Homo-oligomer: A and B are copies of this chain.
Amino acid sequence: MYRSAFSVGLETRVTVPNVPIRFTKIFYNQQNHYDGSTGKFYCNIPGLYYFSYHITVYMKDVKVSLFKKDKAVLFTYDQYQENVDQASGSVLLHLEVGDQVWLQVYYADNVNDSTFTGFLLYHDT
């Protein structure tokens, strides 16, 4: 077991609600573990993963959820001001092969520049 990472961004001003955000700006996706057609990352190497995301907040409160498998694992709520902020979150999640993770915003506007990043830190041995 070895490498798995992806870093992606949202170029589109609106997204979408209650569905996986399909980030289209690919900063990195070498092993293509991030599915650009679904906005979901798929775990092919079991291990500890680090995910980091930032959802643009502008004029409207933002509620984001990091989903793993079929459920929301992490929640971020950010009130606006008023100011462009980022509803950010980072977490370590051990993943098994098959586990998919993606983000959702509970049309969501002014989400452009939002980013979703994740990487295999320690592979299971």
Residue from B6, B27, B50, B88 in contact with A73 in the complex, judged by beta carbons closer than 8 Å: B27
How many copies the complex holds: the figure is 3
A44 at the interface (CB under 8 A from B): no
Enumerate chain B residues within 8 angstroms of A78, measured Cβ to Cβ: 13, 86, 112
User: Which label, helix, strand, loop or mixed, suits the secondary structure of the A interface?
Assistant: strand
The CA-CA distance from A40 to B61 in the complex, in Å, is 32
- Docked-complex contact B5 and A121, CB < 8 angstroms: yes
Check B11–A94 contact: CB distance below 8 A: no
CB-based closest 4 A-B pairs: A7-B92, A77-B112, A52-B90, A28-B92
Given A2-B122, A27-B93, 16 more pairs with CB closer than 8 A: A5-B122, A7-B90, A7-B91, A9-B74, A13-B76, A13-B79, A52-B52, A52-B90, A54-B90, A63-B84, A74-B115, A77-B112, A84-B84, A86-B89, A89-B115, A119-B122
